[PDB]
Amino acid sequence: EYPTVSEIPVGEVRLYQIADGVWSHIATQSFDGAVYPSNGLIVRDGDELLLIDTAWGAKNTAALLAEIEKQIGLPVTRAVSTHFHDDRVGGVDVLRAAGVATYASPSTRRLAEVEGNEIPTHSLEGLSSSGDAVRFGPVELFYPGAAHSTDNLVVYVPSASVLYGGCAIYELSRTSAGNVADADLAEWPTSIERIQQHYPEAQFVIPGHGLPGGLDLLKHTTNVVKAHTNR
Numbered sequence: 001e002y003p004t005v006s007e008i009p010v011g012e013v014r015l016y017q018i019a020d021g022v023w024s025h026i027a028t029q030s031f032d033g034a035v036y037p038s039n040g041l042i043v044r045d046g047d048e049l050l051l052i053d054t055a056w057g058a059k060n061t062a063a064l065l066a067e068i069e070k071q072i073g074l075p076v077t078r079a080v081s082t083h084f085h086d087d088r089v090g091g092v093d094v095l096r097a098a099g100v101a102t103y104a105s106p107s108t109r110r111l112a113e114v115e116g117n118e119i120p121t122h123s124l125e126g127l128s129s130s131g132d133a134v135r136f137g138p139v140e141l142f143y144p145g146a147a148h149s150t151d152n153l154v155v156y157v158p159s160a161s162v163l164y165g166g167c168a169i170y171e172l173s174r175t176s177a178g179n180v181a182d183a184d185l186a187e188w189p190t191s192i193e194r195i196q197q198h199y200p201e202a203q204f205v206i207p208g209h210g211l212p213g214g215l216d217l218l219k220h221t222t223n224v225v226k227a228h229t230n231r
């Protein structure tokens, strides 16, 4: 079974096999008086691993690297952060100290700096306008437009038809808006339309927080976002 928030002590990281060469990583962290679960992705990149997002903090990200070494045993050589919040970039300094080349869009890097968060080293090219996509090793990176944040990226693994939505996609059990401080609520439904348009064959859809599902999570997120807007 997919691990839930109450099953993971803060500081421990679980790995979950989604498909051949594709894992999610699951961690937990305290934020504003509560503890939340958080997902990222790991994709085999030949003899190396590509990491999508940190495990939300330095200590968690160190635990992530240790679990990867124990369970998978290939080196993480590159990481992509899919937006500027600490559940995506917190731990980039640990990754860099471990030899990982860290990447994000120029916008994510600037937004992280203003927020006082850690800053991925390298700028991704070609992701500036809504609908832009670039190949990055075994994945495609897609900028769907503003949603959960203005800079949020999604990631597709063609080999396995896995769509990693990050925090622009909600799990099915979430029925109220999450952290929308940095969101563009008016654009978010259209950005989800762009994801659906680009990845209609997705078989597994991974939200930034909580349980994976299928493309039903896209319509579900749109419903939650719109209802919050009508409040």
Ligand SMILES: C[C@H](CS)C(=O)NCB(O)O
Pocket: 031, 036, 085, 086, 087, 167, 178, 179, 209
């Ligand atoms: C820090 C992280 C950025 S997306 C967050 O807001 N977690 C709480 B959530 O509602 O899951």
Ligand SMILES: [Zn+2]
Pocket: 083, 085, 148, 149, 167, 179
């Ligand atoms: Zn966020």
Ligand SMILES: [Zn+2]
Pocket: 085, 087, 167, 208, 209
């Ligand atoms: Zn998040």
